[PDB]
Write a protein that binds this ligand. Sequence first.
Ligand SMILES: [Ca+2]
Ligand SMILES: [Ca+2]
Ligand SMILES: [Ca+2]
Length: 183
Amino acid sequence: MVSEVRKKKLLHVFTVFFDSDKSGVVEKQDFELAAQNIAKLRGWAPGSPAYDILQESMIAIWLGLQKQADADGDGKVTQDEWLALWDEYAKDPAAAKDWQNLLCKSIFQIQDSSNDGSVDVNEYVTVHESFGLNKEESTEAFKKLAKGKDSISWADFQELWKEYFSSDDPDVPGNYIFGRLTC
Ligand SMILES: [Ca+2]
Ligand SMILES: [Ca+2]
Ligand SMILES: [Ca+2]
């Protein structure tokens, strides 16, 4: 129902971008930590105005994730619960659209700290470094996304997002939106 190419991409997002604390299970505290880690690299003090926008944005991703995938209502999203959602969307892709669109927008919002509506290499790399990825490797992943440009527009980002979550092609540029892939 889900190709190994897409499984690899789904579990990379789960293990790197959702499970910040590496417990193996996704919980609200992972997204509080994610906001803390990004704010620390940006030099945004906790309780600062900029910090609370970032934390709110991160809590909004968590609640959308919890509503979609926490099937047993324990307040946690297992790796099996994440893959189980995507088996559901494989039968009814049309139902994925509202949530995917909100998640796409949230992820772009967290990266675009200048609010100019494009993601530059320092915006992209800084967020990747906060999630524990290699700087040089994220710099290379950015170069594969930006097609020669200094910035990724919102419009380019929505296309790259669709490829990352939908394409069974192991080598489309959208496969780089969450940096160099983990196996
Ligand atoms: Ca966790
Ligand atoms: Ca659960
Ligand atoms: Ca920007």
